[PDB]
């Protein structure tokens, strides 16, 4: 409901939708997300598939399950770009998953959940880092 928030939801939603469907600051972040995020998905494919299964076994809602898991990642009080990029990446992996089970309409809310957790709970952190400009330079 602000400019960090809508700019975050722009990047995340876009990345998740283009991953599922196979194909200034925001656009640079998206480029970085494609480079790094596609990497994470290749290299942690076995782990991601294991986690997806686990989520599905406990069928409590894919985007809600994602939300609980995502909150737990940050419970130790540490925040960093690795954590943020790994979660968006796992989000993309789950978004591809939702598309393969003819549940594309759940991708938009997935994207919102991730953004909510990010901007709502890590705002202070995101500001000190110069938002998505920090992200781009961290992985540059």
């Amino acid at each position: 409901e602000d400019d960090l928030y809508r700019q975050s939801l722009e990047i995340i939603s876009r990345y998740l939708r283009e991953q599922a469907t196979g194909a200034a600051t925001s656009r640079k972040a998206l480029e970085t997300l494609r480079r790094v995020g596609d990497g994470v998905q290749r290299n942690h494919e076995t782990a991601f598939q294991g986690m997806l299964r686990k989520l599905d076994i406990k069928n409590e809602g894919d985007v809600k399950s994602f939300s609980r898991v995502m909150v737990h990642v940050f419970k130790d009080g540490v925040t960093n770009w690795g954590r943020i990029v790994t979660l968006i990446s796992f989000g993309a992996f789950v978004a591809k998953h939702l598309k393969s089970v003819n549940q594309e309409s759940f991708i938009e809310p997935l994207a919102e959940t991730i953004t909510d957790v990010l901007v709502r709970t890590k705002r202070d952190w995101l500001v000190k880092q110069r938002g998505w400009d920090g992200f781009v330079e961290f992985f540059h």
């Binding site: 737990h72 990642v73 790994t86 979660l87």
Partner: peptide
Amino acid sequence: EQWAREIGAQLRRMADDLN
């Protein structure tokens, strides 16, 4: 709960490596 803790820590460790 334990399955969400396990998955969360699992993502945390790989994330901290990438970082």
